[PDB]
Amino acid sequence: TSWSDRLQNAADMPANMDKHALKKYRREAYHRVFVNRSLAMEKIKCFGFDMDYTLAVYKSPEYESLGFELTVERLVSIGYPQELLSFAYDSTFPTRGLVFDTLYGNLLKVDAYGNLLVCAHGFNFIRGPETREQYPNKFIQRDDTERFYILNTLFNLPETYLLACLVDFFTNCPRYTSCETGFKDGDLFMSYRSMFQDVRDAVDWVHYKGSLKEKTVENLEKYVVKDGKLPLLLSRMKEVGKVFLATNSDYKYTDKIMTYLFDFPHGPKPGSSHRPWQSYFDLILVDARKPLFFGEGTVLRQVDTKTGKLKIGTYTGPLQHGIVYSGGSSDTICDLLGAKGKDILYIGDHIFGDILKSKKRQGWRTFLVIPEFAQELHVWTDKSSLFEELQSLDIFLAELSSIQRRIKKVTHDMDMCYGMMGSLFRSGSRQTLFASQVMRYADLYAASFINLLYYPFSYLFRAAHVLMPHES
Amino acid sequence: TSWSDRLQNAADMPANMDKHALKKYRREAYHRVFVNRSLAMEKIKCFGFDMDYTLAVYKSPEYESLGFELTVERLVSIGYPQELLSFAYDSTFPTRGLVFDTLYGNLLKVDAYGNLLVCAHGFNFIRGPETREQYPNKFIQRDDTERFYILNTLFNLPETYLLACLVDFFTNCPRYTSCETGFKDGDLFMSYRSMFQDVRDAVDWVHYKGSLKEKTVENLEKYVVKDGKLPLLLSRMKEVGKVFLATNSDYKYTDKIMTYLFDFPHGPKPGSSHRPWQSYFDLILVDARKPLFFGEGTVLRQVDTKTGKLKIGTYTGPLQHGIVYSGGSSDTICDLLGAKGKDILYIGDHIFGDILKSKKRQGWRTFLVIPEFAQELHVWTDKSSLFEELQSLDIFLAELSSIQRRIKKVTHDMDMCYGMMGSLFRSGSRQTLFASQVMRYADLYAASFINLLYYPFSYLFRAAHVLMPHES
Amino acid sequence: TSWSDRLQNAADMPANMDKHALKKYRREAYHRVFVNRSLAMEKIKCFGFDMDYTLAVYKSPEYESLGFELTVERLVSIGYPQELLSFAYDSTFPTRGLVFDTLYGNLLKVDAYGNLLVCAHGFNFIRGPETREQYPNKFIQRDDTERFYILNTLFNLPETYLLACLVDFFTNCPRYTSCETGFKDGDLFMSYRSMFQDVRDAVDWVHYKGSLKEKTVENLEKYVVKDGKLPLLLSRMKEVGKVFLATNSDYKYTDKIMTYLFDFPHGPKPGSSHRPWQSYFDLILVDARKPLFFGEGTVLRQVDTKTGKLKIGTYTGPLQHGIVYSGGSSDTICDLLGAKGKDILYIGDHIFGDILKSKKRQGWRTFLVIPEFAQELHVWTDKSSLFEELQSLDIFLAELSSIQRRIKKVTHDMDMCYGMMGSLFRSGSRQTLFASQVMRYADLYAASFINLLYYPFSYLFRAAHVLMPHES
Amino acid sequence: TSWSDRLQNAADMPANMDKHALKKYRREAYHRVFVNRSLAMEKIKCFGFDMDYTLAVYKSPEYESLGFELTVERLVSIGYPQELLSFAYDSTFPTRGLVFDTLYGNLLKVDAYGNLLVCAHGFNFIRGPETREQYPNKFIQRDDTERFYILNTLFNLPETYLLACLVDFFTNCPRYTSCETGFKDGDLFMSYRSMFQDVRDAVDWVHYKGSLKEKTVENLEKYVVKDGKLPLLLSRMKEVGKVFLATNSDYKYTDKIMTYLFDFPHGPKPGSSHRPWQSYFDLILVDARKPLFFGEGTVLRQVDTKTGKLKIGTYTGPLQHGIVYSGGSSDTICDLLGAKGKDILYIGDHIFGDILKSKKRQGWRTFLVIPEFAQELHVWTDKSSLFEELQSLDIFLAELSSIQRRIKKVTHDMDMCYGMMGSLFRSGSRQTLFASQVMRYADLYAASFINLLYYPFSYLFRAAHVLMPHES
């Protein structure tokens, strides 16, 4: 059972909007919205969305596997060895948020301070003392963006696995000699940095020039979660505020995906007339180019929705019914909707991108969708006895060895319940960079934004005030 | 009673090193070290220091007043009006960490998200609704460094006050017409941005070219806290690890100040032979140019300690006894002392500078000295009933107006106990940017690093593990 | 008769290598090599070439017309109006080296100092006094690269004409309102800058992603000049020095074009065995990325010549027979051939690019091919009586009005003999920027590098020494 | 007899303004204005000047020697060896326009293409073949500004000589070991790059913070050429156009120097009332910050001429009588004087700076003052038989060894007549970079702008039209 299986199981359920049923439902951890900073929903005047992995949650592991396969095919196409074609995506390996070290060809799981939690070279998980040879301080400077690439998006899951497969393959292929920084084949030297750049370029190519979108749209039921409660929640949002879409995707793809997402034999609820997806939005903006969107942005354009092409000219007019915009900036949204940043709840999955930038640059309120959380929460709740043991061990050690070996063992057994690279949010008792970023920049979070359906219009989401050590 | 009065009162006390006395002493909040992240002192192999406002804590408000007076004199010298000479420093106005908005000429106190807590234009504190005219979202983008300057150092206290004095003066002087972005005098327009740049340039000039250092060194008893326990703690550090100085100051000034700091008729303890200040350090580095120091740094040079001039040439040799270094980088320290970053505890007052950068760039452990904390902690403890009331009011409001007016009143009365710009760490129930940065980057903090004297050699400083909302 | 007709007529002639015949032939202006700086051919050890418009001279106006048509089709494809499809390339309009002013939508012909010689808005040639409204000093700052784009390559001929066609079209189309900086259609505004960027992007797309290369290679006889003397000259060069190819083109295209260029039923001369094009080169380098090539370059790669794909890895080996390189830098050539810059004669058409950069960055000797010179020289020689009259008029005016009107008339009549935008090299008595750049950076120049065939192995090309005014 | 002796001898002569006398006087090469591009004086509406080395020509070698001595004193002051104090300026060594190679510590004289003409390491002039070890292509990339510094101003004459003295000193001092890129003293290594940076910093310090200006103004007769014809020419300019000063110097220094320059017991001519220097200018601008001046410039300020300080505020008003401006941009001049660039003749000595930039950025007309030309022209005319022999030898060699040795000998003997580094304008038959830049960017040039006094109001300065080789 993948995280998207959990999402689809919940998607198949009809909405019981009886107030006591709703109160009962959001008691359950899987239907809750979690709160890092207090948020009075009555003050939200505009609800904004990203599309990919937010409105359109791609099914796992099918979609990752498709991306993986097409990326492999592209690399072979440009000259990588035929053996790559024998690789097959394995969802049990990657966790989101890993760092690829282009100098030494390692995948690293780090905390918020750049401390090493896990280090794998290909499929070889490197123990603590061997890690010191390459990382003397068990630390990386993660903003050395020439060396380190942080694989923070769900689109980066296939390349996370592909990188490890490639390191493994070249290491074990007798044609290549393994060196500290890459592989030697006579008078050719393939650095890990060049290999990474080829992988990155290929993934980009698959998305922008290859067949990924075409293969997705030709089998939307295989690849995209669909939930009849989606128009219900969007219609409710539109009763109390404005609703907008701001997506990096182009109009043609957006239209295909959104049409699918709303393709039911009814509108907001069973028995109601179906309505086009566009009617659920006060403002639709495609080709957003986030994160540049949250700064200078790009020229505001208008989509000719008959052809899917841009009209000639920068668009200088007002918000009008039926118009679809392209490019622009976050200020476009504010201006056209008459909103100030704190009046906006922006809903998306890109934590290091949309969510961080909308918060830091514009003071928008944020809701982070974490598609994998459906599965993570299962594991967290099922294995809470392991975590509790780990807490007790840390506490007992501190108050003053055999205890350290036990801590290592429990840490490993806990982490392996999530996958080879462990939980998105931690390794044992140590939080990841990703966990830290969610706490810092996501006002609210959940496995799906559909969980807002279970809270009333003017709910006050509450978090405890943070105190300094001397104030506590 | 200023914060430096508190520091000097504690400095005058002899050290009772009986273990039970030490345990009793660090119970008291004023002699504690506070802990944001756990730190096992037994793992620290090197103790590093900054000088200014760390080893050499300048007395308040005398030193700020001197800086203020010399900066005013410099501005008048370059053509500012003679009326500036009637200004007098007032320590009850500035709090450290305010943001000068060069567009509208306001001092702003913000939270970690750029939300406005306080806004003053000159000496006029602007209420919430009037704040919306210039800050529609009650928010600033604090990394818009062309517009906003964050006054984060204690050296910035006099200019914090001077900026407000200047805005007040020009506003009320009939020769000038007050405009949105500056002041008009016929065919001359002085923007707030140009005024700020003159102030910044003048403060820099006073420190680097003017008489501030000369006036300080000619009356060190007036201007610099002195504590006989300083050589005791440094000598104890040197029994268990290496000790280093890394200061932006030049050798000649460093030598004057450090000689004063060690000028007692004894060495580490009463009855022991006096020893030169240099003997307490395994490595002395001046002209550090932090924060560039924590990246590429500058060429490593050697000081001719007879002349106080640099020797000709980049220094390419090993650590040797009696050598004093100039420039270099954080890697110099690591290389010469044989240390990895987590083996180092770096002690300084510059949170946004040395402490943040040493942590983020190098994974050093950090101890933040906060000179004003001696006074802040007094006020915090004396007015804890006001804070507790504020907590109860927030809690009562949330569980569902007259209560809001009460919250505003209590917030104001609490804040005014600290000064006109309130606590370094908060306004009412809201934490400042500065508080957030201390929590994030200072592993340990206190009003003085001398508080380490009260903890044993291998003490384990403990902080609770942070949990995400769904983990709690 | 186009310039490429002249080149092909000369290409059809067999080579008479009798020394007296060769001496007679290079007497004629059309078969001469012209000399800006003295060059002793005996000191040249390496002859290097570009491919496009150097070895492979595209036929005119056919090739420009193809590029024009495909660029138009691309613009219509992305949403430009269908009326564009009625445009047809006109070779009598563009001259190479014009400046597009993206602010006001003008094509400008300038001198080396940025002084305006010609200004056309669409097809309206703007007289001197109307030019002052937009160019008060009849001057542009040509290095303001945000505003001005210099159309210096033969690939820029179709877009030169397309820009004028578009300005004309939008000006005369009643749907658009002509404004100073672009065109208004209700709530859409198309700036000249945005229009130019679309044109530039479309031309790039046609070359890199569209069908231009495919359409060229499917009818090479229509599109590419072919000369049996080419292998004769290259074989002679290889008797006295090394020969190299450095092209921005990819291997697959290079191979198609070069195979065509050498496809005769003989090798260097009639009666000799045919030899593959690769055998004429000591070093073949594709994907050169000039001008970056003349600085840091890119990673050196090796082409798998069976597949046309790159081999995996940076190539670290020596020059070997049959290897084809990709990327690298000008230092690659020097290292592998054992050459110093002044030992190299580099032959190309890109004056502002390859020729200027190889000279300035590396001190290479340069030979500039100017494909249009075959026609320009015809016109120059036929209309020399007009030029002589113009000289006499300038001289008579200076020694001290009706004469100015005559000067304007003769200038116009002369210029119109070349085309609507006049000579590549001048307007009347004033030299263009392009002329100045040829003099400054091309040691040698001619309509074809084949003219080197008519000079002996160790010929001394001589130019007069330049004297300052006080030295003369 | 120095070049400034020649200038002062001509300065001492009264002006005979009889038209036939003026015609006779400017026949002589020393009183001529030389012409690179034609210039109709009747079209000039504004005459602009720099001050230093233009209006105020510093006497040689006295002024260079003063600068040299103060720079040496500063280096010794910051820790250079006492032996530096024995150096003494020698005007026979430096020629302006040399390139310091910070990698290998050489002074280089180059042509316009970066080809090496002369190479000296300290005082050792390196012959051609030894030059190849460090410069394999006898070429430098002169825009590699990290490595090469071009000493283009007369203020750079003392440091030109100082650099050679320092290389010589360290080479011959037994304490230092000479290495390829600097000097080793045990564990100290002084690179040539660090040595150059110290020299550059010291020269800057002498001008901006040291005593150079003070020592100059206390003995203006020793240090500054003075000519009673200066107010005569400026007064004549003001009869036909506007006159402006744009100087990088501050007001206080400008006022001292200009007051001296006009301190005669008369005004424009003997017998006329003296008038203040300011009355000769329609616009006076100080603190110009050229070359930034010719782009964005700096904020326009107004000088309080009573105090010599800036008034508070950006100046937003019109041109008014008696105002003195500070900062601003070249557009300030155009706006306030109502001029377009080609209406302006700008007169200065900084060829690579003011003259090049005003021409390239703004299309101003240019007059280059070359103070050394007074002496260079003497040598040129006296040794023209050597140059003529050299021309004959080059010509005889070309038409086809003993002749090459003769060419080298004559080249050396000619060059040595000018000084150790030869003529500003050439080495033998090869022109320097400086010569090329004068031809390219100075419309007019002479040893002094006073030579304009000898041409009538509406003189047409004529230069021959440049033709390409195929046009000739």
Author numbering:
A (entry chain A), B (entry chain A), C (entry chain A), D (entry chain A): 3 to 402, 417 to 488
The paper states:
In this study, we describe the biochemical and structural behavior of the three most common mutants: R367Q, R238W, and L375F. Crystals of all three cN-II mutants belonged to the I222 space group with one molecule per asymmetric unit. Overall, the spatial arrangements of the mutants were almost identical to that of the wild type. The L375F mutation is located in alpha-helix 13 (amino acid residues 375–381), which interacts with a 3/10 helix (amino acid residues 485–487) in the neighboring subunit. Consequently, this led to rearrangement of other surrounding interactions at the oligomeric interface; i.e., the NE1 atom of W382 formed a hydrogen bond with the carbonyl group of H486 in the mutant and with the D487 carbonyl in the wild type. On the other hand, the R238W and L375F mutations stimulated catalytic activity in synergy with ATP binding and caused a decrease in protein thermostability. Interestingly, interface A also includes helix A (amino acid residues 355–365), which was well defined in all the mutant crystal structures. Helix A is formed only in the active state of the cN-II enzyme, and the stabilization of this region in the mutants is consistent with their high catalytic potency even in the absence of ATP.
Cytosolic purine 5´-nucleotidase (cN-II; EC 3.1.3.5) dephosphorylates purine nucleotide monophosphates with canonical activity towards inosine monophosphate (IMP). The cN-II structure possesses the overall fold characteristic of the haloacid dehalogenase superfamily: an α/β Rossmann-like “core domain” and a smaller “cap domain. Whole-exome sequencing studies have recently revealed that somatic missense mutations in the gene encoding cN-II (NT5C2) are associated with relapsed acute lymphoblastic leukemia (ALL).
